[PDB]
Amino acid sequence: TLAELLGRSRIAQVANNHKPLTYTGKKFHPTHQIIETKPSTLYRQEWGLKSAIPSKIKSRYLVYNDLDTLERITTFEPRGGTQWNRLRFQEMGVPIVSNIGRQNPFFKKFNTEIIGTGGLSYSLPGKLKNSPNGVIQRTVVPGRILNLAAIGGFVADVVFFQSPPSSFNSMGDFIRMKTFLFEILEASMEKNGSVSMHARLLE
Amino acid sequence: DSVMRKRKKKMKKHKLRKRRKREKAERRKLSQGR
Amino acid sequence: MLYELIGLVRITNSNAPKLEAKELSSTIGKLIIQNRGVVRDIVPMGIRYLPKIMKKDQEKHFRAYHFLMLFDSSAAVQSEILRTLKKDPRVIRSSIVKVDLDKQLDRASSLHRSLGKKSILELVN
Amino acid sequence: KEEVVKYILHGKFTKNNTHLTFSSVVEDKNLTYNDTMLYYLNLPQKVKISLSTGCLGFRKAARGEYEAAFQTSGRMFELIKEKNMLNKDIEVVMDDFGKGRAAFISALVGKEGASVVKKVVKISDATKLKFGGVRSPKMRRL
Amino acid sequence: EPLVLSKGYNIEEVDKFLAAIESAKRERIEKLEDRREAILRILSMRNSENKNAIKMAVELARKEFERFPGDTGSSEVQAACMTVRIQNMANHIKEHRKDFANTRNLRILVQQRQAILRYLKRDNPEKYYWTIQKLGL
Amino acid sequence: PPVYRLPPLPRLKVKKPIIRQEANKCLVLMSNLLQCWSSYGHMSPKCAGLVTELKSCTSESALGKRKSNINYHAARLYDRINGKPHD
Amino acid sequence: AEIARSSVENAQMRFNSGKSIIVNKNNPAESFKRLNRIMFENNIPGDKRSQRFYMKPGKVAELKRSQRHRKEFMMGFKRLIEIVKDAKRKGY
Amino acid sequence: KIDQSLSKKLPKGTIYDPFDFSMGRIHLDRKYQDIMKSGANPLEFYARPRILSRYVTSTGRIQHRDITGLSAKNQRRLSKAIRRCQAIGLM
RNA sequence: AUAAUAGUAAAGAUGAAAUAAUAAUAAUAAUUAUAAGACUAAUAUAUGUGAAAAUAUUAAUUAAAUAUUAACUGACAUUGAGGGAUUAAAACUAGAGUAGCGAAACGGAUUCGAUACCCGUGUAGUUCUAGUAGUAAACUAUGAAUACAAUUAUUUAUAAUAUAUAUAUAAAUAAUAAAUGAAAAUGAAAGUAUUCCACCUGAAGAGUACGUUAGCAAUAAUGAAACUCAAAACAAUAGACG
Ligand SMILES: [Mg+2]
Ligand SMILES: [Mg+2]
Ligand SMILES: [Mg+2]
Ligand SMILES: [Mg+2]
Numbered sequence A: 001t002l003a004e005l006l007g008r009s010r011i012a013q014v015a016n017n018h019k020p021l022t023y024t025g026k027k028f029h030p031t032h033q034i035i036e037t038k039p040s041t042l043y044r045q046e047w048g049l050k051s052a053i054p055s056k057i058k059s060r061y062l063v064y065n066d067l068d069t070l071e072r073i074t075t076f077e078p079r080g081g082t083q084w085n086r087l088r089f090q091e092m093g094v095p096i097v098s099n100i101g102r103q104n105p106f107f108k109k110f111n112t113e114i115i116g117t118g119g120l121s122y123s124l125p126g127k128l129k130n131s132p133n134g135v136i137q138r139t140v141v142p143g144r145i146l147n148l149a150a151i152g153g154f155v156a157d158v159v160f161f162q163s164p165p166s167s168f169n170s171m172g173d174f175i176r177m178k179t180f181l182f183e184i185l186e187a188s189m190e191k192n193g194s195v196s197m198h199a200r201l202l203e
Numbered sequence B: 001d002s003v004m005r006k007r008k009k010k011m012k013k014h015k016l017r018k019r020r021k022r023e024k025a026e027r028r029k030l031s032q033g034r
Numbered sequence C: 001m002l003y004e005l006i007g008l009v010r011i012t013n014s015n016a017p018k019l020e021a022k023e024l025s026s027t028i029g030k031l032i033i034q035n036r037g038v039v040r041d042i043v044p045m046g047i048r049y050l051p052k053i054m055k056k057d058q059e060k061h062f063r064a065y066h067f068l069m070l071f072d073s074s075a076a077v078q079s080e081i082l083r084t085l086k087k088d089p090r091v092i093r094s095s096i097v098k099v100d101l102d103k104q105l106d107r108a109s110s111l112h113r114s115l116g117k118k119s120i121l122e123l124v125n
Numbered sequence D: 001k002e003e004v005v006k007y008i009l010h011g012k013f014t015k016n017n018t019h020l021t022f023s024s025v026v027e028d029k030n031l032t033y034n035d036t037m038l039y040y041l042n043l044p045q046k047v048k049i050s051l052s053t054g055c056l057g058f059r060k061a062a063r064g065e066y067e068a069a070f071q072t073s074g075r076m077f078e079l080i081k082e083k084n085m086l087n088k089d090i091e092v093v094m095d096d097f098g099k100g101r102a103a104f105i106s107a108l109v110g111k112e113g114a115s116v117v118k119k120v121v122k123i124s125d126a127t128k129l130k131f132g133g134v135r136s137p138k139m140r141r142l
Numbered sequence E: 001e002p003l004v005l006s007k008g009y010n011i012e013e014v015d016k017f018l019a020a021i022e023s024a025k026r027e028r029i030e031k032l033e034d035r036r037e038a039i040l041r042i043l044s045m046r047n048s049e050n051k052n053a054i055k056m057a058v059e060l061a062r063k064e065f066e067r068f069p070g071d072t073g074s075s076e077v078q079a080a081c082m083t084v085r086i087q088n089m090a091n092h093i094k095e096h097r098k099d100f101a102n103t104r105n106l107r108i109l110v111q112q113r114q115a116i117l118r119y120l121k122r123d124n125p126e127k128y129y130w131t132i133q134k135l136g137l
Numbered sequence F: 001p002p003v004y005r006l007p008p009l010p011r012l013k014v015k016k017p018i019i020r021q022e023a024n025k026c027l028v029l030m031s032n033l034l035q036c037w038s039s040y041g042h043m044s045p046k047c048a049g050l051v052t053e054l055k056s057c058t059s060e061s062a063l064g065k066r067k068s069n070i071n072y073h074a075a076r077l078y079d080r081i082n083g084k085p086h087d
Numbered sequence G: 001a002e003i004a005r006s007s008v009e010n011a012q013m014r015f016n017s018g019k020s021i022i023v024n025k026n027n028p029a030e031s032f033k034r035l036n037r038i039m040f041e042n043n044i045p046g047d048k049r050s051q052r053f054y055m056k057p058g059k060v061a062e063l064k065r066s067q068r069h070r071k072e073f074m075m076g077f078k079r080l081i082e083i084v085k086d087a088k089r090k091g092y
Numbered sequence H: 001k002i003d004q005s006l007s008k009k010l011p012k013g014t015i016y017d018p019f020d021f022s023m024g025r026i027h028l029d030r031k032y033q034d035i036m037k038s039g040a041n042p043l044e045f046y047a048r049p050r051i052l053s054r055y056v057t058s059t060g061r062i063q064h065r066d067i068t069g070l071s072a073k074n075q076r077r078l079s080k081a082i083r084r085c086q087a088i089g090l091m
Numbered sequence I: 001a002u003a004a005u006a007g008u009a010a011a012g013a014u015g016a017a018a019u020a021a022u023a024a025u026a027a028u029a030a031u032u033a034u035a036a037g038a039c040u041a042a043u044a045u046a047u048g049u050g051a052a053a054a055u056a057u058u059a060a061u062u063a064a065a066u067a068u069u070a071a072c073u074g075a076c077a078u079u080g081a082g083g084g085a086u087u088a089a090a091a092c093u094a095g096a097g098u099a100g101c102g103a104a105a106c107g108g109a110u111u112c113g114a115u116a117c118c119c120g121u122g123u124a125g126u127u128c129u130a131g132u133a134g135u136a137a138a139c140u141a142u143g144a145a146u147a148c149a150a151u152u153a154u155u156u157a158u159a160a161u162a163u164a165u166a167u168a169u170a171a172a173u174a175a176u177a178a179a180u181g182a183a184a185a186u187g188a189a190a191g192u193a194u195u196c197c198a199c200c201u202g203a204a205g206a207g208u209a210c211g212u213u214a215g216c217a218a219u220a221a222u223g224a225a226a227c228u229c230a231a232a233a234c235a236a237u238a239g240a241c242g
């Protein structure tokens, strides 16, 4: 029947939620399903939703809550930043392992809690990564110090041998401007779904 | 009744009240003993 | 009929403040039991300062000792107890208030209910 | 004994006139504990300089105005400075939200109340209101 | 009456229950007696509200009038139930003269009673007459 | 939370739309100079450059440099944004 | 006496009302502004102004209703304009 | 050096975005910002001024349901409890 | 309001001024300390609750009150002439009470005049207890009851859901469809229908006179005619005007 087709179809596939698109609180993982178009479909304003989406939007990705509202507008936000964070994490290549002595959940009524990682990493911890220069022991990643350090779409705890005064005290609260290199030690994941990275400042 | 129409009625009522006030002693005289 | 009470007693003596309170509690409890009543709990509260300088007849008070007595009685009994409280010189403010027993039989004091414990069984345990 | 603990600057700022008042909180160093504590709580006051903006030669209507109040405040401050009640701390209080209240605070802020400010420990309003009470006059037609 | 209890309790039953509890405890004196006394005081009519007493009176009336165990709504039993309330309402009014809302309520209640007795008379006259005689009307 | 739906209105418009432009540079400099002169006596050379800067600012005119489309949008989108029931 | 001495004006701080603030010596003006704000929040000047004259109880009730309505309209307007702003931002 | 109001401190475990460093983010954050709400009748707290004083202005006035943000019934119960409190000495 | 403290020449009022139980007999402001009445800030939306008048400081007593289930009664219902009871404010009769307010009265202003609007003294009255009386724009200017009809958004309560979700119910409130309507607009009624009661039949004269009944009274109800007009009224329209 039609009903069966509807149940199958791509709008039914997007699991509904009425969480805020603007959430100024702490964001530990994606809230909403990111939805992309193709360039062609964007050109004729079609996203595979109830209505056309405004020609002002030139980004291919978005997030939404309601197909149509009482205000006669779809409730959306044109941004898909969460995919890029995931891709950055993948690039960094630091495999998430549970610091607590437990089996990997992907191997072997309902539990709504996050099964291992939320699916930002299905990488396994045992691999090395060779290159022309050699086998990479230390993962080199550029990040920004805030005061904690922003390292490729994630905030991370930082440690060092000696606190460098020349770089820090010259610009005390404009440290965000200057990008510093980092050596990421390991990535643990807590119950709330926050990725607790740990980096080391290189100079 | 609009307010304008009411005002005629009000005026009439006032006139009546005045008449009653005037004819108090006369009314008293008429009432007692007959 | 379960009636809660809140009496804010006088504390004249500096070193031994609770004595007057204790005497009051004894007397009113005695009255209750003589008059078919059943005192369930006598919750003490601290030597708490009053919000304003509250005054009885030809006296003034800034600090008092507070307590709840959670007793059963008749209505007439309760009323008379209230009157006796109003009369006496060693209490600043008194307040009896009913605790409704249409649903339950065991009911703790208002403070205990606010904390969490609905019945006195919970408090016991 | 008579020890001055602190001074209190009172300012009643009505529609038609201001009343500035300076007064010393006079504690005696020299019975029941409760009574002593009560005495400590409400220390007796003695008035030192009373002032109303007609005292500064503002007659009838001008005394309800802003400049007049400011002048009165300045005069008060001068009196405080000269008569020598600046050794202990000061406590500002107000009433009735007139124009003159606005003047007084501005005067205190500025150079006219320069010497006083440094002793002013607390500002604390005490306007009187009624929770029902006596019925007010009928609202004038005009 | 002296050992009558509120909350739908019966004194004989309560004592028996207490004894059974004691026996169970033994299996698994002065103090116990004091506790029992406290319980009785709590559940006594004379410490409880008037509402409980009224309810008891209504139940008694129902028991008296019910033409079979289940009956609630027999025109006669309805009238009997009304009567107890009326009596109590009348007593309240006698205490409180100017309580006009509750006088109105009383009035309505006796009008309702009259109406149901009128109905009973039409339906089943002898029964109606018997009911009247019982109620003192 | 408590939502508040308006009735049908003739025209949604803000009576006066504020732009919220930045304060003038010359005025700021003048205020700074005033503040400096409150301290340091009348005219000491701590505020020697500030006065010069003020003069430079206020040479051609007393102020240096000399609207928000919000009503047009409200007017445009009122009929959409209404929860007005059908015709 | 000794006990009174030990109680170093402990009650004096808690007994006083909320219409009172400790002045910072660096900025009396700031303190005054804060006090004024507090007074505004408590609606004390407006209450005082209301209390100067008597207003018939039905008339004051009507006024109160009108004020409430005005309030509710304003937040309805605010809600509407926020939606309008969102629409503008998005493209609608 | 710079003040705290013009720099968003991203928490430790959180994700961020290029936008999140901006002025506009900070403005957005600024724009967008209990036992009685938990589900217990406030008329238990009439001998607990400490807790009832939270639902009261500095002077002593009770706060409006727009401010306190309660269920209407629950708000009225709270108000009742407060009034009971001030009838007694305590509060 | 009285008294005390210390303190100094004005205070209070208004559009601006004066008169007054204001003040050089030492006030006003301030701080205390007594007393007296009457009112009830926030919460508050009269939301809700009450038959309507009404009704928001606290407590207690007695009365009445909601929903859903279970059982019972078996049309016992609806409306309601006459009748009955309650019925704001003012008013009246007793006996208390009397702070504040405040008809009247007197005085000061304002004004050509000012029997006013503003200010000052301020008596009845407002307050309580016991009554009388039974009217108000007593208004939703809309009598009560039942069956029914298209949507949406808000809350409120009920049930299930696997306590916090998205669902089914009701209830109210706000926008409407249809329909009705002189239109304004009404919107589950001012719609579609059925039942019962009250009331209207041009304007003036008139809710007047006479009569009767009731009231301590003011008054309340009942309620005509002659005489005289072709008027009189409502919704909306466009102006002019403020
Ligand atoms: Mg008509
Ligand atoms: Mg007056
Ligand atoms: Mg009937
Ligand atoms: Mg009705």
Ligand SMILES: [Mg+2]
Pocket (backbone or CB within 6 Å): none
């Ligand atoms: Mg109120």
Ligand SMILES: [Mg+2]
Pocket (backbone or CB within 6 Å): I088
């Ligand atoms: Mg009224």
Ligand SMILES: [Mg+2]
Pocket (backbone or CB within 6 Å): none
């Ligand atoms: Mg009267």
Ligand SMILES: [Mg+2]
Pocket (backbone or CB within 6 Å): none
């Ligand atoms: Mg009299």
Ligand SMILES: [Mg+2]
Pocket (backbone or CB within 6 Å): none
């Ligand atoms: Mg007058």
Ligand SMILES: [Mg+2]
Pocket (backbone or CB within 6 Å): none
């Ligand atoms: Mg009567």
Ligand SMILES: [Mg+2]
Pocket (backbone or CB within 6 Å): I135
């Ligand atoms: Mg009449």
Ligand SMILES: [Mg+2]
Pocket (backbone or CB within 6 Å): none
């Ligand atoms: Mg009538």
Ligand SMILES: [Mg+2]
Pocket (backbone or CB within 6 Å): none
């Ligand atoms: Mg009315």
Ligand SMILES: [Mg+2]
Pocket (backbone or CB within 6 Å): none
């Ligand atoms: Mg239509």
Ligand SMILES: [Mg+2]
Pocket (backbone or CB within 6 Å): none
């Ligand atoms: Mg029709």
Ligand SMILES: [Mg+2]
Pocket (backbone or CB within 6 Å): none
């Ligand atoms: Mg018609």
Ligand SMILES: [Mg+2]
Pocket (backbone or CB within 6 Å): none
């Ligand atoms: Mg309508």
Ligand SMILES: [Mg+2]
Pocket (backbone or CB within 6 Å): I210, I211
């Ligand atoms: Mg006749």
Ligand SMILES: [Mg+2]
Pocket (backbone or CB within 6 Å): none
């Ligand atoms: Mg008549």
